[PDB]
Design a protein around this ligand. Structure first.
Ligand SMILES: COCCOc1cncc(-n2c(=O)[nH]/c(=N\c3cc4cn(C)nc4cc3Cl)n(Cc3cc(C#N)ccc3C)c2=O)c1
Ligand SMILES: COCCOc1cncc(-n2c(=O)[nH]/c(=N\c3cc4cn(C)nc4cc3Cl)n(Cc3cc(C#N)ccc3C)c2=O)c1
Lengths: 301, 301
């Protein structure tokens, strides 16, 4: 029993973190086979960071301008190129610790583990969700750029996020490992703002099922509702509209608990309209939306 | 910016997890140098588990009754002994991945990372705190016995917890790595109950400082209080009494935020007496007590 914000074991990724330095600008990189991936912002000097022309800055560099350190071992850079907002540094040694891996792009509402790193050294691991506005609410300090987000399935690491910057609201923006930003953000020092966000409804319902599996039942009721009346209430509370595919994905949890999906939606409507009255669910006093149905099944089955 | 429940990177521990099987009873073990540590309950058959005499059960075993598997490699058991509630299996191969390590026992209110494992295979990592009643609120399913809790300091893994059982309330009990239980629990199938718990006050104040560092300020006030009037309110809300050593430990966070410790205690008193009024702190609607001052400093500095 129990339900926690659980990350994937981080070892497979720890073995790929390195430090990349260009001049006095430094950040983290990801070493897979004989390639090091990192944010292209590393080629910026202090005066370049406000409004850089990255093609211009890159053509003025050569391989020896990039110092890559894996532990204490310096890796020799033998090629460089730019791929969207990521730099690819070809090195003369293939990383012996390379796991099986994939570069995947994720959808809003999906979760992943983040390995926060500084100076190429991993410091901590936690779970994140990609928000509807394509930001993540991470925990990153100065020097964390190039830290990666990932999921693990059968020894295969699917990398989905590399961290670039913090926005003024304190949330985080980055790219997939192909260098393409999540959301309408650019790697320049402009005051950029995250768009409006919404609550991920299917995740809240998955978490309510997790609560039932773990013995919190107080929010259940004999009421039911229709999908459209539920969505009429969701809209009023800034919740994503629930779709039939969402209902479908919740099928397994519904079966294992014996609470029909639209019944649990009736529960959620009541919770949105009346609050929790000093009561908690799985140790939380608000409705949690950063657990996917898959996350719930993994921890509760 | 940002504040998350952050675990230590788990790789150093992943390299030490193995599976231990005795008859048809199986669980996880920890392989360090040429020794495998695991819960002694593994020597119990189904009929032994209710009321076992472990000395009797152990003397009836020989080395070949223990099957230890590290990945697909079977490790040959060459000695066995019992140390309190842990079994030590000497194997003929020293684990090449052994990190620098220590066996330490922790105090209520201290936190640690848990690497949840099944069949010797790590599945997830999360942060836990040792409660005042010596339980932890973990996330463990059947087969998780032998999973370990740890902290990491400068490449040294301090192991502090090995998981044994779930109590009827769904919280978790286990031992230090010397085999000595945290709390008044025994490794037998008796209905055992966790004693009363309290809220860890110094941790709540540390978390309020984390909130200020991250820009949540709404709960601050010009009020102040004395330690004893604060404690008079704490007692009423089942909070641990705050001591001068706690005030001392909060010194650094107080300095970096410029909010005196007893000022923040005035804030906490107001929060306990009036609640939060639909407002949140660091994304939570209740007062969080599983972050130590050290945890806060690590993530916010
Ligand atoms: C309470 O803490 C508040 C700060 O927290 C943070 C959380 N996440 C990230 C950061 N962060 C950083 O650390 N560096 C950071 N620029 C840098 C500054 C540097 C100074 N030297 C010597 N070398 C440096 C390397 C970088 Cl890259 N930029 C800005 C940024 C980074 C990238 C990338 N890639 C792309 C575009 C931008 C505008 C940032 O946003 C800070
Ligand atoms: C929603 O889930 C509810 C269950 O969640 C859990 C969370 N934590 C732990 C458990 N758990 C388990 O997994 N096994 C478990 N006994 C076992 C049963 C087994 C069957 N075979 C084939 N082999 C087994 C090995 C174990 Cl050890 N015991 C009980 C227990 C274990 C130890 C140890 N060491 C010492 C004393 C006791 C009484 C337990 O409490 C279950």
């Amino acid at each position: 029993s129990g339900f926690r914000k659980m990350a994937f074991p981080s070892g497979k990724v720890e073995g790929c973190m390195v430090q990349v330095t260009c001049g006095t600008t430094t950040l983290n990189g990801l070493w897979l086979d004989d390639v090091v991936y990192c944010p292209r912002h590393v080629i910026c000097t202090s005066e370049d960071m406000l409004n850089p022309n990255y093609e211009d800055l890159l053509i003025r560099k050569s391989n020896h301008n990039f110092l890559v350190q894996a532990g204490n071992v310096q890796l020799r850079v033998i090629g460089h190129s730019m791929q969207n907002c990521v730099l690819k540094l070809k090195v003369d040694t293939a990383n012996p610790k390379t796991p099986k891996y994939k570069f995947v792009r994720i959808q809003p509402g999906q979760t992943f583990s983040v390995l926060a790193c500084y100076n190429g050294s991993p410091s901590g691991v936690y779970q994140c969700a990609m928000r509807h506005n394509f930001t993540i609410k991470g925990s990153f300090l100065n020097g964390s750029c190039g830290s990666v987000g990932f999921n693990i399935d059968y020894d295969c690491v699917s990398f989905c996020y590399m961290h670039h910057m913090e926005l003024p609201t304190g949330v985080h923006a980055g790219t997939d490992l192909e260098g393409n930003f999540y959301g309408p953000f650019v790697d320049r020092q402009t005051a950029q703002a995250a768009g409006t966000d919404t609550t991920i409804t299917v995740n809240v319902l998955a978490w309510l099922y997790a609560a039932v599996i773990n013995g919190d039942r107080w929010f259940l009721n004999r009421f039911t509702t229709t999908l459209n009346d539920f969505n009429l209430v969701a809209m009023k509370y800034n919740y994503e509209p629930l779709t039939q595919d969402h209902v479908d994905i919740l099928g397994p949890l519904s079966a294992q608990t014996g609470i029909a999906v639209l019944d649990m939606c009736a529960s959620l409507k009541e919770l949105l309209q009346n609050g929790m009255n000093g009561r908690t669910i799985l140790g939380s006093a608000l409705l949690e939306d950063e657990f996917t149905p898959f996350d719930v099944v993994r921890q509760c089955s």
